[PDB]
């Protein structure tokens, strides 16, 4: 019982659509209400959404920040409001504000592709 | 091949994933001196920019045998540019696991590998951890990397089942 705000940086590409609909669906599977807020790649629109989200008394924010610097103020305002923030895919350049920042291991994947690059092309030559 | 020339499409130069992916790749490839990166250029993680850059690359360095791309959108643009030039011989490698690259790999086009991310799992994890938090949990790492997997012609059926 409670509600989560799914704050997505944009919906102009299928990657972010998948993130947003999946978080909303999972929140509802776990007994929460959830709503998607599209920032349309605009930190001012993101901030306005945070205003609405705080005013509406949401219990948690699932956050895909528009800007790793520009979005800190917004997470700071959620923190001051008492609303925990969980970042997904993109993060913020501040520590101790969001509870967690979840992202894909880009360096590790680079190591995996370098290995196969050499193997594949060594075979083909 | 005593020398094997290749090109690299970087992502947006100002974005750290460009460099985590590129530096991960080069931390391996550079220890094999037969591989010579003959062209390196940003295509801004963008499909249509990758077409235009690859087009310029192919008329400048036709000796390349492979193109490594910092993401799949860029690999898709490079493929369309290769086919337009007739350069169907060039092996293209990407990153993300985008459906369009997955389909290109399984149908035997010149894109031959990518790195699978799991965005549904990370979106669900943020929700699952919020749930745990609202239920009382306060012990969470702040920086949470989620792992990835290599996708090849040889294991593609694991990713299309």
Author numbering:
A (entry chain A): 2 to 126
B (entry chain B): 16 to 176
Reported in the publication:
We therefore decided to continue the investigation with the truncated construct RBP‐Trunc (residues 142–310) instead, which is related to the RBP‐C half and expressed solubly with similar stability to the N‐terminal construct RBP‐N. For this, the individually purified RBP‐N and RBP‐Trunc were mixed in an equimolar ratio and then analyzed. The x‐ray structure of the heterodimer closely resembles the parental protein. The heterodimer displays the same opening and twisting angle as the paternal protein, an important indicator of a native‐like configuration of the heterodimer. The asymmetric unit of the crystal structure shows a dimer of RBP‐N/RBP‐Trunc heterodimers, which is in agreement with the oligomeric state observed in SEC‐MALS experiments; however, further analysis is needed to determine the precise conformation of the dimer of heterodimers in solution. The observed heterodimer interface in the asymmetric unit is mostly related to the interaction of C‐terminal residues of RBP‐Trunc located in the hinge region and their corresponding ones in the crystallography mates, ruling out the possibility that dimerization results from the extra elements left out in RPB‐Trunc. Finally, a closer look at the side‐chains involved in ribose binding reveals an almost identical orientation compared to the unliganded state of the native RBP, suggesting the correct formation of the preformed binding site. The results show that the halves have native‐like properties, that interdomain interactions are important in RBP and that these provide relevant stabilization, in the same way as has been described for other multidomain proteins (Brandts et al., 1989; Careaga et al., 1995; Kantaev et al., 2018; Liu et al., 2019; Vergara et al., 2023; Vogel et al., 2004; Wenk et al., 1998).
